[PDB]
A paper describes a structure:
Toxin-antitoxin (TA) systems in prokaryotes are modules composed of a toxin and an antitoxin. All the MazF members are RNases, responsible for the cleavage of all types of RNAs participating in translation. Consequently, the activation of MazF RNases often leads to the inhibition of the translation process, reduction in metabolic rates, and eventually the formation of “persister cells”. Here, we report cocrystal structures of M. tb MazF-mt1 and -mt9, two important MazF members responsible for specific mRNA and tRNA cleavages, respectively, in complexes with truncated forms of their cognate antitoxin peptides.
We synthesized the α4-peptide (Asp63–Gly77) and measured its affinity to the toxin by ITC. At a molar ratio of 10:1, the α4-helix completely abolished the cleavage activity of the MazF-mt9 enzyme toward tRNALys(UUU). The rest of the structure assumes an overall helical conformation, and it retains most interactions observed in the full-length protein. Interestingly, the peptide appeared to bind to the interface symmetrically with the isosteric residues Thr71Val72 acting as the central residues, which are located exactly in the middle of the resolved peptide (we only observed ten residues). We found that the removal of the first four residues and the last residue (E9-α4 (10-residue)) from the peptide made a remarkable difference, as evidenced by its inability to inhibit the toxin, although these residues were disordered in the complex structure.
Numbering used by the authors:
A (entry chain Q): 67 to 76
B (entry chain A), C (entry chain B): 2 to 15, 23 to 114
The structure:
């Protein structure tokens, strides 16, 4: 659900 | 216009959108799209617990909701697409307490 | 589950990977794979700052790596794919101080 945000700013 | 600590914002999840509370401090914002804002997701489908304190429609959600403090995440500022409202001081204190517990801080 | 607060684990970010420090408390672990663990990503490409304290190779990572505490995020336990090491207690205190600042806690 929120999984797509796991890579933000990295 | 920029997200402020204690604000409830709609967050683009890349595409669904869900509310979240801004919990990082205002002094960190430089105003670029790719900076990280720390937010606590808000859900209208999970039960309240001490680590999921409730969030009322007065604070910007459409239905009785909870702040999922265990789901705390830094996300790109560009994902914050609309301000929905602002939390009561007591709601923010409950969120701060949950985050203090989760992260084992003083 | 097996990741413990203060551990360095390799995190699969979907494929990219980064080391990260486990910062959520051990009592939250129920032993399901999709439960959320809160981690601080480690970077070897950013300079140290008061909010990016250094992590020593003794603790399991590459030279000149820093804990990017502003990038704190909850991830599924299944994303922690390899135990890399453990932080010295003073590094954990530097991270706890950075997170206290970032999140506006007492």
């Amino acid at each position: 659900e929120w999984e797509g945000t796991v890579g933000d700013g990295l | 216009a920029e997200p402020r600590r204690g604000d409830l914002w709609l967050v683009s999840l890349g595409g669904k959108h869900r509310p979240a509370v801004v919990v990082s401090v205002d002094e960190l914002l430089t105003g670029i799209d790719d900076e990280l804002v720390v937010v606590v997701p808000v859900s209208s489908s999970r039960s309240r617990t001490p680590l999921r304190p409730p969030v009322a429609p007065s604070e910007g959600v459409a239905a009785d909701s909870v702040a999922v403090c265990r789901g705390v995440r830094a996300v790109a500022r560009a994902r914050l697409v609309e301000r929905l409202g602002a939390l009561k001081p007591a709601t923010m204190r409950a969120i701060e307490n949950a985050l203090t517990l989760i992260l084992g801080l003083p």
